[PDB]
Amino acid sequence: GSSGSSGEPAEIKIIREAYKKAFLFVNKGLNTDELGQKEEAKNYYKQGIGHLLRGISISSKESEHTGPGWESARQMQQKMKETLQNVRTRLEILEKGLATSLQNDLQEVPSGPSSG
Numbered sequence: 001g002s003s004g005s006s007g008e009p010a011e012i013k014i015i016r017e018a019y020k021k022a023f024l025f026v027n028k029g030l031n032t033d034e035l036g037q038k039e040e041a042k043n044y045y046k047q048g049i050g051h052l053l054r055g056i057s058i059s060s061k062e063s064e065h066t067g068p069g070w071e072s073a074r075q076m077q078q079k080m081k082e083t084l085q086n087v088r089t090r091l092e093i094l095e096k097g098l099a100t101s102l103q104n105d106l107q108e109v110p111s112g113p114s115s116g
Contacts, residue, residue, distance in 0.1 A: 009065070011058050012073045018055030019076040022048050026083065029090070038098050045091040052080045052087070 004013075029044030056077060060070075095103045 009069075011060070012069055015055050015058055015073050015077060018051045019080065022051035022055055022080055023083070024048075025051065026087070033094070038094055042091065042094050042098070045087055045094070049084065049087055049091070052084045056080050056084075 025044050025048035029041050029048065032038075032041040032044060058077075060074065060077065096105075
């Protein structure tokens, strides 16, 4: 939806971006928290979290993709998968630290398809 040049596999070009923006909005969330702006901080993470997925949800499976560009791309991808798990926690201790009544808690994913 922008157009640039017919060179990248289209998939990588998307990972090289989702990785930057995903980490860009992150370095911001941490700052705010330090400044004393919980609200904003929560929002920042709410954005970076999305980009993380957009980059982790790419077709990185091909039986004919032997190139150096895919190497660095695969590396950055892993970074997110590691950052996210770390971000989720931050976005948790934050919300639970702001609300005084209730804010997303009582939850227990359905272990099985049916208790029987």
